[PDB]
Each structure stands twice: as C-alpha cells, then as structure tokens.
C-alpha cells in the first residue's frame, strides 16, 4: 500500500534486486578462505540459513 510502510522493505528491495538480474554491475566477483563453522554445518546451515 506504500513503498515505504516499514517492514515492507523486504518486498520492495527484493523486487528491486529481482529486476537487478537485468542490470550490469562492476567488474569484480568474490573471494573466500578460512573454515570454521561451514565445514560440517551442512544440514544445519541448509535448514537454518536457508538454502532453498
């Protein structure tokens, strides 16, 4: 009913980021390295962090 509203940020921002598929970006990507929780967090991370 309003693009602001509060709490409605989820809908708005995700819709905006949905349409971000047809957008450019920059040039770089990502990076990682380490290992502590992820390693054997498999089922827990899937369920609680949500890998749909």
């Amino acid at each position: 009913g309003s693009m602001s509203h509060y709490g409605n940020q989820t809908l708005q921002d995700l819709l905006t980021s949905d349409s971000l598929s047809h957008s450019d970006g920059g040039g770089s990507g990502g990076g990682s390295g380490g290992g502590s929780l992820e390693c054997d967090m498999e089922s827990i991370i899937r369920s609680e962090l949500m890998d749909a």
């Binding site: 989820t10 995700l14 949905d18 970006g25 040039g27 770089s28 990682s32 502590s36 929780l37 992820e38």
Partner: protein
C-alpha cells in the same frame, strides 16, 4: 569497532559463505555462475555490508549467524511469494 574476541572464532570463509547466501537470497540468481559475475561484486557488496552490520550487532558469531539467517530466510520466502502471487 568494539573489542569482541569472538572474531577468532569466525573466519572469512564463514562470513563470506553466509554473505554468498545473502546474495542468493537478495538476488534470486538464474544460475550459480551469476554468483561469480561482475554483477556479483555489487550483490556481494550488499551482502558484505549487511553481514558486517550483524557481525558488529552480535556478541558471538553464533548469534550473528543466527539472526542473519533469520533475515535471509524471511527474504527468501518473501521473494518466492512476491514472484508467485501476493499482489
């Protein structure tokens, strides 16, 4: 900021891993290769900034990871139904 010794109990891989999922949630990716794309630096830029907020908001990595997982979770179902039919 703030001395929070729990930083030794959280690695870049863990944080960046979560951040990677944040992207998957903020950006419903059409393909996993879009997650290593030039658009990715932007997507991950958000993910890093957001994760950083919760990282500093929490008093443990367990906590930061929990609360952040809750935000990403609600976002994913938000995106699914918004795309499927709510409006």
């Amino acid at each position: 900021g703030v001395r929070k010794g729990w930083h030794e109990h959280v690695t870049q891989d863990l944080r960046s891993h979560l951040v990677h999922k944040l992207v998957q949630a903020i950006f419903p990716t059409p393909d996993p290769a879009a997650l290593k794309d030039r658009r990715m630096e932007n997507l991950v830029a958000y993910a890093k900034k957001v994760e950083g907020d919760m990282y500093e908001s929490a008093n443990s990595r367990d906590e930061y990871y929990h609360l952040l997982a809750e935000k990403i979770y609600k976002i994913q179902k938000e995106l699914e139904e918004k795309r499927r039919s709510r409006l």
